[PDB]
Nucleic acid binder design. Structure first.
Ligand SMILES: [Mg+2]
Ligand SMILES: [Mg+2]
Ligand SMILES: [Mg+2]
Ligand SMILES: [Mg+2]
Ligand SMILES: [Mg+2]
Ligand SMILES: [Mg+2]
Lengths: 77, 223, 149
RNA sequence: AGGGGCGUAGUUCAAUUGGUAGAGCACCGGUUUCCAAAACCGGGUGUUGGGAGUUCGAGUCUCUCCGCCCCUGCCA
RNA sequence: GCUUGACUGCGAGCGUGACGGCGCGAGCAGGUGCGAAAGCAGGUCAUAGUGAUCCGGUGGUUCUGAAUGGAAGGGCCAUC
RNA sequence: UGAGCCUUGAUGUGUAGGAUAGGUGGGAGGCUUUGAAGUGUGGACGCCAGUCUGCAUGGAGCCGACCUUGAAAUACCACCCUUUAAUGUUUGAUGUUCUAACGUUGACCCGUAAUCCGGGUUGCGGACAGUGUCUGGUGGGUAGUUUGACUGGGGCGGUCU
RNA sequence: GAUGGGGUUAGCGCAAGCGAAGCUCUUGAUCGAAGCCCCGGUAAACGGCGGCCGUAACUAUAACGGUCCUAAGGUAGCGA
RNA sequence: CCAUAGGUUAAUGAGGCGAACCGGGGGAACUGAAACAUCUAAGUACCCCGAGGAAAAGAAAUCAACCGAGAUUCCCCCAG
């Protein structure tokens, strides 16, 4: 499903407003993108479904550090 | 193209950048390079544009330092005001005879002052005095019952100003030989009067730029 | 996205030059191709450490260069003899082989290559001025006395 | 509301852009031919919506007094 | 002819409405105008010319001001 | 190839006239082998009336200055205004040459007894496409509703203070 | 987020007041595509195919029109 | 090419059921407003996930107001 593998961002629900404030249910989905991240230690490309906000944290945290937290959650690669 | 006289003028002043009053007045004193004594020529640009009728400004200011610019005063008045005008030093005082002298072409005066009763006679001179801007106007204080004061107030260094179509102010604070400190006071006194004259609707910086120049001198910006 | 260069990528500079550059550029190109590494505190200290390491290496190779230099520069004149060369017509030359051993004197070894013999191949007999180049910037000097057999 | 726009002879529409408002067709005349009609002219048609400024002087620029507009816009 | 009473604060007592309300009012206080004064003037001979509340806008105001000093906002007055 | 300013050059005919006489002061000056006037095309533009000055030539002349003219002059200056032209400064708009993101429902290899999927190789495309947030337009495609009362029944007509 | 307006206060002022810097409330210059306005095309696209006036050797009628509305006013064929 | 993916064993663990209570992910409409859009109904009904005997919450970047209080939960007031 539409879940970020780094930040865990998932679709959330809200209201479409209007000039009359009429509220209709809607969904907010993350800005997810499938990207192939280069992991130096394995000298390989690993593809991750990440949000645009997740991309920013990868530079700040390091490619190895973020993957270590994902392994704590436990998943396939 | 440019001669040596003109090139040294622009070499002394670099007008591409702004200058402060202290520096500007120093530059003005070094720009006085002419055979005859020069007069400071004001070059102040107003953000407000006279293209709107109601935004026009007419004003007057008496300067203690003075300018030196000829101040021969012709006065249109009768009775006690004629004696008071003569006692105040008016060079010419009369009514119909002086108006007819003006019609005959005797224009040996620089400033006309009229009493409101004399406006009937001065109105006939509108074809002559109007195009030259010599016509007395109440908004500049040259139409007053206190004729003696208007003759006084003038004489020394009373200066006039009227906005043009391009919304620019071209007055004269005084002669170039005047001391820098006095000239700074002269322009400063002028500047406060302009602030009072400013209207309200004008949604723009009252002054678009302040510059000073002499007869052949370059324009130095004032800050 | 601060990153420390590892080579002379385009106009960014040369190896070892931290420069500010748009995130995407390095996030996917410099690093997955190995052309650079983020100049992060941790990485930058290692970088500067390696830098200073090689810097002290250069210092030593040039420090030990002046060592060899002085060792043989100050006098250290040689007078080894070999073939039937005497005076007048010194007959044969002294070349890379014998000369190296001479100045070495079983000690100050100077490679036969460095034995830069400027004045031809030193055929005439007499005082001769021979220089050595222990290091590229070091300009060493030696005097050689040739004597008969 | 806010930003662009327009109101010249009975017929509409050009302009000038401060100095200087024509053409259109309708009408009456005059030409043209042996004669008619068509054509070609003369000419009678105006305050440039209106009002006031600015001006040496503006139908022209400005302020606008409005009508008629196109775009756009707001919870008594 | 001269003027701004088309005044401000009030108001005994009444009228008419289910009510919201609407209408009339001598007199009182402060300041006016016209009269020499007595006096008259709180719009127009009278009865139609009109729209509640909420919300928002404007001016005024020592009323309020979420620790305190301000301020925002609110209240009151004038008013759209 | 855009739109800016910055500076510079150039541009200012209702007319009278000096006439290619912006705007406003300053201004009696002006003015100058440093190229006096000149003289020769540097002139291009323009009203073809005029204007500025490749540069060479000559060496002190040059010019506020009537009249009308708004009017006194690209004789005099700040420097600006219009017509602008070049010049310096900034965002973008397409086009292209890329690959490295990304795409491949192109080929090939492997997982593999596999027209899925994944990985690899390669080709093509490529900073597009596509997707997310925000946003303008469109949208009976799909919803939630409204669509008054009096009234010789109702509607229609009329009426509502 | 150009510019302008407010709030606050370091400070200066007997205090009236002024007001640095910072923070903050707001004003919205500039940029900005489609769309709309605008310019064309398209009816085996959805659709539309009227009035007025004059005019044939008698009348009549109006081809021959003219005129207005309009975008343009019904052809062939058929028709109580 | 190492590797990696993959593959084969061996150990453990989980699978389902069950009343309500609990936490979380989704989430109405009828109705009320004497209509009806904001609003109400209602984060209710319902669906889904997970856990326990309880769950959840919990040891101040909390309140107070210049005095002080000292985690969370629950009850009565404050208070319609
Ligand atoms: Mg009356
Ligand atoms: Mg309903
Ligand atoms: Mg009914
Ligand atoms: Mg029948
Ligand atoms: Mg209801
Ligand atoms: Mg248990």
């Amino acid at each position: 499903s539409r879940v970020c593998q780094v930040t865990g961002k998932r679709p959330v629900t809200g209201n479409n407003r209007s000039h009359a404030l009429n509220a209709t249910k809607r969904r907010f989905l993350p800005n997810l993108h499938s990207h192939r991240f280069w992991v130096e230690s394995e000298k390989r490309f690993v593809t991750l479904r990440v949000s645009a906000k997740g991309m920013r944290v990868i530079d700040k945290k390091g490619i190895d550090t973020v993957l270590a937290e994902l392994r704590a959650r436990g998943e396939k690669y | 193209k440019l001669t040596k006289r003109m090139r040294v003028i622009r070499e002394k002043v670099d007008a591409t950048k702004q200058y402060d009053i202290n520096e500007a007045i120093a530059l003005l004193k070094e720009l006085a390079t002419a055979k005859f004594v020069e007069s400071v020529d004001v070059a102040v640009n107003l953000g407000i544009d006279a293209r709107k009728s109601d935004q026009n400004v007419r004003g007057a200011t008496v300067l203690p330092h003075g300018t030196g610019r000829s101040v021969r005063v012709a006065v249109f008045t009768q009775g006690a005001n004629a004696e008071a005008a003569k006692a105040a030093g008016a060079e010419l005082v009369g009514m119909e005879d002086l108006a007819d002298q003006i019609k005959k072409g005797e224009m040996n005066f620089d400033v006309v002052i009229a009493s409101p009763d004399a406006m009937r006679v001065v109105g006939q001179l509108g074809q002559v005095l109007g195009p030259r801007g010599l016509m007395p106007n109440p908004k500049v204080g040259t139409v007053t019952p206190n004729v003696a004061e208007a003759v006084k107030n003038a004489k020394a260094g009373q200066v006039r100003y009227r906005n043009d179509k391009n919304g620019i102010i071209h007055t004269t604070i005084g002669k170039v030989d005047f001391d820098a400190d006095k000239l700074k006071e002269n322009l400063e006194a002028l500047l406060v009067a302009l602030k009072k004259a400013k209207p309200t609707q004008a949604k723009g910086v009252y002054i678009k730029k302040v510059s000073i120049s002499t007869t052949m001198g370059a324009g130095v910006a004032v800050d | 996205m601060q990153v420390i260069l590892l080579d002379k990528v385009a106009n960014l500079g040369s190896l070892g030059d931290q420069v500010n550059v748009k995130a995407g550029y390095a996030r996917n190109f410099l690093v997955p191709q190995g052309k650079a590494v983020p100049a992060t505190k941790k990485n930058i200290e290692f970088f500067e450490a390696r830098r200073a390491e090689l810097e002290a290496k250069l210092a030593e190779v040039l420090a030990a260069a002046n060592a060899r230099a002085e060792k043989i520069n100050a006098l250290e004149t040689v007078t080894i003899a070999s073939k039937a060369g005497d005076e007048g017509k010194l007959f044969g030359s002294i070349g890379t082989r014998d000369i190296a051993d001479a100045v070495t004197a079983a000690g100050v070894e100077v490679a036969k290559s460095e034995v830069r013999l400027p004045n031809g191949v030193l055929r005439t007999t007499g005082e001769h001025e021979v220089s050595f180049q222990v290091h590229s910037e070091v300009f060493a000097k030696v005097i050689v006395n040739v004597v008969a057999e």
